[PDB]
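Long-time lurker, first post.

We've been arguing in lab meeting about whether zinc ion would sit comfortably in this protein at all. Half the group thinks yes, half thinks no, and nobody has a model to point at. So I'm putting the question to the forum: if I give you the sequence and the SMILES, can you give me back a predicted structure of the complex? Inputs are below. Any interpretation is welcome too.
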Amino acid sequence: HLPFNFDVCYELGSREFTLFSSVGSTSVLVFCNVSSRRLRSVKGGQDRSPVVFSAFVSMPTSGLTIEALCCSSLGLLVVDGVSFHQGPLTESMIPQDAHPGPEGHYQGPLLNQRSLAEMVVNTRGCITSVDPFRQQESFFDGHVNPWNARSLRFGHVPVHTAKPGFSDALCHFLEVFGVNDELAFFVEDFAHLVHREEETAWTNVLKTMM
Amino acid sequence: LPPSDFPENALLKCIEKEIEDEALRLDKEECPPPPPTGWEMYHAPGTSVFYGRRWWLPATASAETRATPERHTIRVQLTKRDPSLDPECDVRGEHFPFSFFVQRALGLYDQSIEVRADFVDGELLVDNVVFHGTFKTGEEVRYNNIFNGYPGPNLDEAEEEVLDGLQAWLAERCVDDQFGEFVGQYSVWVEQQEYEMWLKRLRDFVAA
Amino acid sequence: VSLRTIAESLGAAAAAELRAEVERDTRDGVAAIPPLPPLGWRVRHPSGSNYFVMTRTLKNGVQSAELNNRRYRSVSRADVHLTVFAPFRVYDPSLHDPTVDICEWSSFDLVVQKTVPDNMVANKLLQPLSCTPQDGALSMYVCLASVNSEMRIRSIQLLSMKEAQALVEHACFGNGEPLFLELLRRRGRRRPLVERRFDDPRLRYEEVAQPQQVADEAAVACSSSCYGPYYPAFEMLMDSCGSAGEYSRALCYGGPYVSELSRELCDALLDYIKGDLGVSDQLCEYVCQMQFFLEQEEYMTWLGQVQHVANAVSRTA
Amino acid sequence: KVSKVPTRSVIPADALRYHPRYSVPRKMVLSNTFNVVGENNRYTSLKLILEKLSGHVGRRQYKMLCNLEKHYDKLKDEGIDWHELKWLSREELIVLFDKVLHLTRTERAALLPAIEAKVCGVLRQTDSRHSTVVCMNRGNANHGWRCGRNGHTNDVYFEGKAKANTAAL
Amino acid sequence: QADRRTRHHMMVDGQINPREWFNWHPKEYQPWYFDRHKFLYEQRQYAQFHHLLCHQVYLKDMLHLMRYPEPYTHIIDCRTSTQKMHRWVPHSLWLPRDEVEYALQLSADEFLDMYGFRKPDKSDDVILLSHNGIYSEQAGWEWKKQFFQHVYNYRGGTNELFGESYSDMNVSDVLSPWKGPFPQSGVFVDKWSKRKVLTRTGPFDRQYEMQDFALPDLELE
Amino acid sequence: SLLELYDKAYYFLHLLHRTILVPRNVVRDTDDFTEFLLRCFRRPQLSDAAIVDGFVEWMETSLMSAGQFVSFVEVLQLVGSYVRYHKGVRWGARCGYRLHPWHDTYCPSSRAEQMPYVHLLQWLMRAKPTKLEEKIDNKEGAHGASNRLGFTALDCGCHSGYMTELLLKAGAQEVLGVDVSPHHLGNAEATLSEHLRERRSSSHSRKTVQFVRCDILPDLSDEAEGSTNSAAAENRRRLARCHHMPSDSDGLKTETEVTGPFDLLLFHPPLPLLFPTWPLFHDLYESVDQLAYDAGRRHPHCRLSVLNEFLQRLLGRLVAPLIKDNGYVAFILPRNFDTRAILQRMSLAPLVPLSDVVTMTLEGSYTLVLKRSHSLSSLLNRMDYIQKSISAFIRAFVSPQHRSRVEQEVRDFYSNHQAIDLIVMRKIARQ
Ligand SMILES: [Zn+2]
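Top reply:
Settle the argument with this. Predicted structure of the protein with zinc ion, as tokens:
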């Protein structure tokens, strides 16, 4: 399964795959960084990090670019944050090759209370320990160091958690650009495909070394 | 230190006290702890990273004509902890993380096998084996990402043939529990020498 | 046909949310007054940003601070330049770990530099001044935090051009750090954001370009200093906004872990920063207020940009 | 002689819990209504999970904005259970959320962590007779998403009571 | 909007430490009856001023005094905002609320000079109006502060007479969620009492009661 | 006056380095730069594409710590450094040759700047020594019992290997190059390799050169009855048992290294400059090496604190003396660093002492031998690029009514307030 107009780009050795779309003058770019530690099962039931990706919706008629922090769970899609950047999709805006996008900008309000609903389930969060310097030993990594992760808001929980009726309109607004649940079912299945091919290539390289 | 000219007499006299009792104590050693054989220890005076370096020659069978020499490199970053979360958060456990590079025969992150180990409670805990550069599989798999490179799975979940072959590869390289004890000893001496330099550099800043 | 009614429903809701946001903070017609900074502080907040920088210059050293000047009536040294970088990073650790009794943890960094003027005569050449940008450019980087409106020190770092030269040239055996050299190889400038001036009221109309003049006074004096080509390495070292500057300051010492210091040094360091240097609990509580106010100001521009995007789609489709 | 106090090197964080007598708390058996699994008994685990997902969360008591309690009546009118909700596939959840439930995109986002983890809807025993404790462990497909621990084996609706008896219901 | 988290440091006690230091103790406060539906000065926090409440004149009394006025029953408008008044209540005089505490301090000649109408005698009937009856209630309290024996209030004056939908715009001062309150920032009390006052049992939107003492219930177990 | 011109000119150069920056690959992106660098190289026997790839490699190995965008004045300084490398600095005859320096390296390119080095070479080789005392250190140990046996030397702050070449030309056995940057040491090693390939400084006696990277001064001299014989036997059995017994004790790296003490110990910080070069002329393609004349003058050695720590190390476990008995320390330094402070005291502030006064009053044990102030820094004054640069700086930023007096304020500053002092001192033996 694959969405309608999306080209995949995945080179072996990097835990990243990037999806690109273009309709009219608008360009849609989906970037994902697959976790190396452990990712959750596609059935969901039974350290189990969620599949978090980003979606860049560029519209030159508006003059702004929409960055959508999205989390794919059970094939479906939730959207955690939406931020706006100036101009079109510059190459520096995408966190490929471990160089981040724009720094020191407003991240956006909470569109959904998914992170507060996980603590009722007692699901383990991204923040492992309270000490930020404890998790800064594995620096420049989003999954084990949340204090410098762009997708986890650099550990900051914002003031405003957006109104449900307002932000339901924002999630419907992004679904017309290809940020529907059909993309998140593919990103969930392709992150499990990258996690097997990265672990198999790392093993067979390690066999020839020793 | 006249109090009319210098309003910071509570700090400048306290830091002059802390210079002497950090030098008048007899528990400290003037000499660095002696490293194991081959290892050369570099440390820049301003930073908190000290480097180890040795050359090595493996055991090569008689069917092969030549044994290529290796390049072992140790990289240790000093551990940071946040005192603002105390006494609320618990006491963070003292552990000594370090990196062990292996390069066959010129930098640190080109054609190098990198293995990360943790010395905690008197033993080594090997965490990840990170590759850098183009390696052979079985095709060529390139790991050209130095910050967000694929570090491999954690060895608690890895396959059993990967584990015992790695520890036989690590015990042959003389990386074991006695080597990690020296990294726990050398980083204490490095942090002690940085602290007396930090007290010396702070007295020049406050009194100015 | 569905793209027009979706983009018009969002643009009407964002206009309804921006309308309902202003009337909440408005009291009897006049809008919400921002919290006032302490005496002498000049806050600059760039538009569309996550941070705000405030400066303070104590002339003739520490003795002209606020606490050292109040006395009972009716009965020289080098100048100090303060800089408090404050990002919007505020969280509570009692959600992830319920054993920790912390309601609010807000991090903000303090950069204090010193500058020798030409008017001091008493102690000019008795020793080489290490705080001078001509001699080392020694500067103290105090990482601070606010734990339930109580200022706690995270780290005290002493950074000069020496350890900026050490990281770029000889941090390894014969080379620099391979990640610090690569992070300087990818340094693109940010687009110019128009800053807003939430200054102290008494210094709001006296001088406007004073934090810009002291930022270019040191940048001229450090780039043409005894250490010339290592100033781009020192700019990224003292850059408080981003992850490249946090990794660069982590390659340095990072200070002693403060709870292991003596109790006499812990109270004398707090007496220096709060009492002598002026970076007080009033300033610490103001930063927690100004991180809340300017987050509210950035939510309204976010609501203005949802409406601006949704109106540009509906007029196109 | 000075005897040392017997401690442990590695202790689980559950042992750090507080009891006013520093002892094991009482586990009272559930009421007689839970003896047979029926239509009155089926959806009490679904009701408490939707009650916790809408109430206040954390030490700061963060109120959940989306009220998931309004969808409890239409879920039990269809005859679907919390244990039967975990058996639905991905395609059967999009049909259930959009057509029947009319779950909005933020109400779907607050319910999905409860479905992603496959929480076992087993009423745990407690010190009182009326129990509001549901086992929050992640379920496995071999034991019917019941997490297979403390006697929750593939039909156990309530701790201390009989199985489901699917021939009746 | 959008559910702003508040910068107060109130917190519920954890699951590890024992409950200690019982010379302050928060519990949940639930009164008997709801008071939010009532008039603003008929609520719970204004019960001590219950005898200060002016007697009510109603709509039919106001229409009867419109048709058949009396020479010494003074109808007085207490509305302050001139941009929000559009019609004239008949036989009314303008005495805005925020000046009333000065206006009754004048003499009769100074009242005539500063308002253009004669000062009412202390035995004359005074009837006050406002938009909702709130400014008129505070003005009636100021009129009863001076020795005025007959002071009456028409609750919902303009909004029931002219059928308008206005309000006196009372702020009812509530701290902004960036303003951190007193007991978090301060060393006014010891650390145990500071930790035990700042704790609460449940969500922080409801009301709580602070106990100054507690004894253990030894007779349960 | 000159002080405001100093401040405004350095602020303008900082704004030039901040504002008009161009991308990294200037040959690929900028379409005008290639013909410009070809014009600068065809102004003074190489092909065009070879010069293109050579400047690409020069910007690759030369530019450090720079992002995707490079300052334009830095690109012009890179062009001047490339021109100075492919052209070389000429050292006059007494020994006239050419030297090839790297990008940011200090070489005295004017004769007034080379006169203290030429006079020190004259005092070393004893060509025509008309000064107070002539030096003799270990050749006096042979004459008590000549120049053919040589001596060992120490070089503090070696830049591009010109002073190491001056030590090799005057006759020396072991010289130890100590500098802060390894780039300067690689440049000095290339200069030493071309010096050995030039067949100067003939090899009747063997000479080994070691370049070490360190701070101001290196420190490597601190490594750490029958019971003594029993402990030696137990030590031998433990070394043979734990396989730490050395099978060979030649140690050729310990022979080819340079080890103290030294009888000639020299120290020369780079001369600080009054005004940087003007990078905005119309004839930049005619002379770019003079635009790179200021290269190398920003080094971590030219300070008063470095001089004070150097003098305190020379004055005082006490195992390493670091200087031979009655050894000669030769230092070439200006009157004072930080020329802004020199302009501040010109016509108030108290009079600033000279570094000669500091070196005299700190070392009461050492006796001065040569004290010569080369005050011919005003004697440069040609029609060359430095006079055009200072007239452009006085033409752009100074009012026309206050110009020429400020020009006079320049002309006395090089005459009275700046000079190059070469001073040699001699150690006094122990009692
Ligand atoms: Zn269970």
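For your lab meeting: Strands of chain A lie at 7-9, 16-23, 26-33, 51-59, 64-73, 76-86. DSSP finds four helices and six strands in chain A. Whichever side wins, do check it experimentally.
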